[PDB]
Enzyme design. Structure first.
Site, short mmCIF file in Angstrom:
data_model
loop_
_atom_site.label_atom_id
_atom_site.label_comp_id
_atom_site.label_asym_id
_atom_site.label_seq_id
_atom_site.Cartn_x
_atom_site.Cartn_y
_atom_site.Cartn_z
N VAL A 16 42.96 17.06 22.93
CA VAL A 16 43.35 18.20 22.10
C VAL A 16 44.86 18.19 21.90
O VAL A 16 45.34 17.99 20.78
CB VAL A 16 42.88 19.52 22.73
CG1 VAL A 16 43.40 20.72 21.95
CG2 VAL A 16 41.36 19.55 22.80
N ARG A 18 49.03 18.99 24.11
CA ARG A 18 49.85 19.27 25.29
C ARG A 18 50.44 20.67 25.21
O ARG A 18 50.97 21.07 24.16
CB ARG A 18 50.99 18.25 25.42
CG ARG A 18 50.55 16.88 25.90
CD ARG A 18 50.37 15.91 24.75
NE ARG A 18 49.81 14.64 25.19
CZ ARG A 18 49.50 13.63 24.38
NH1 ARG A 18 49.70 13.74 23.08
NH2 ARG A 18 48.99 12.51 24.88
N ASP A 124 55.65 33.79 28.28
CA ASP A 124 55.67 32.78 27.23
C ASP A 124 54.66 33.14 26.14
O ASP A 124 53.86 32.32 25.70
CB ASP A 124 55.39 31.39 27.81
CG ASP A 124 55.92 30.27 26.94
OD1 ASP A 124 56.93 30.49 26.24
OD2 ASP A 124 55.33 29.17 26.96
#
Ligand SMILES: C=CC(=O)Nc1ccc(Oc2nc(Nc3ccc(N4CCN(C)CC4)cc3)nc3[nH]ccc23)cc1
Length: 286
Positions: A16, A18, A124
């Protein structure tokens, strides 16, 4: 609280991307990320302590220690970033989808801010870390350059608090409404955005934005973190606004050749249409 798995039990399929590295794949669909090098172990284990405590609809569900590996719910829909700005063809979405997404995000973050004994800060929050399922209608967060969505006290080293996640959500709200990348014009390296935000620069205001929404959005942008609302207040406000945004459960299925007008007059046009909102709002008020 988790459930071990035999590595032989898993059948890899595809890769997919990183965030470590994530790969598609168990007991008849899952997403896994294997650790790379021992430097990420000390963090990899923390995630485990956290996700095993977590159990919320709008947070990725965590279903091996040799090799060290995680087995998480697979989000067939991809990242919100790829939906807003990803590869052609891009999907059409409505004001209801923008608001619904943000609401579900606030729901998941509020659950983190409520954990006992201590709260959990994502720190984040950005579309690349927000995954979608159920035809793009359900949003789920995965804790596993973020300058555009980073509260100004964070990158200044000041001892921050959970209110930094509020600032990010505010920016995310502007992003789904305009379908623009925040501070894309600024450019340059990360520090050129930090200097701008640190000086008070915020995304341009939006033509025809409902004052209730313009109020909440900017309140989340405030320099003073104590003037920002709590997530619980956001969840409540967003929940009550969804009454004026029906059709959030409608899947994404139509394409959209999307023209991006340039930021003229420090005031941009929204991608979503607020016509239906004002109409429903006049009904209740009058
Ligand atoms: C552009 C930003 C981006 O994609 N960031 C990102 C974030 C997480 C990620 O790993 C995961 N993915 C997913 N679903 C998923 C995510 C992304 C994608 N693709 C589709 C193809 N391509 C457009 C790239 C993105 C396909 C499926 N579910 C997960 N569950 C637990 C981890 C995890 C994979 C990628």
């Amino acid at each position: 609280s988790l459930h071990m798995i035999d590595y032989k039990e898993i059948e890899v399929e595809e890769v997919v991307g990183r965030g470590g590295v994530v790969c598609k794949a168990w007991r008849a669909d899952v997403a896994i990320k294997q650790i790379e090098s021992e430097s990420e172990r000390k963090a990899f284990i923390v995630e485990l302590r956290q996700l095993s405590r977590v159990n919320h609809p709008n947070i990725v569900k965590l279903y091996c220690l040799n090799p060290v590996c995680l087995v998480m719910e697979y989000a067939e829909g991809g990242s919100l970033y790829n939906v807003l700005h990803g590869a052609e063809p891009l999907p059409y979405y409505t004001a209801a989808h923008a608001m619904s997404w943000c609401l579900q995000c606030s729901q998941g973050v509020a659950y983190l801010h409520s954990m006992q004994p201590k709260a959990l800060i994502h720190r984040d929050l950005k579309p690349p870390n927000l995954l979608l399922v159920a035809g793009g209608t359900v949003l789920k967060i995965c804790d596993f350059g973020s300058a555009a969505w980073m509260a100004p006290e964070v990158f200044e080293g000041s001892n921050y608090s959970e209110k930094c996640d509020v600032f990010s959500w505010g920016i995310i709200l502007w992003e789904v409404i305009t379908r623009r990348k925040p501070f894309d014009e600024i450019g340059g390296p990360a520090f050129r955005i930090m200097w701008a935000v640190h000086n008070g620069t915020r995304p341009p205001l939006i033509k025809n934005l409902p004052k209730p929404i313009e109020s909440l959005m900017t309140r989340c942008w405030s320099k003073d973190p104590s003037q920002r609302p709590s997530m619980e207040e956001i969840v409540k406000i967003m929940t009550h606004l969804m009454r004026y945004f029906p059709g959030a459960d409608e899947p994404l299925q139509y394409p959209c050749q999307h023209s991006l007008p340039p930021g003229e007059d420090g005031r941009v046009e929204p991608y979503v249409d607020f016509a239906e909102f004002y109409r429903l709002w006049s009904v209740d008020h009058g």
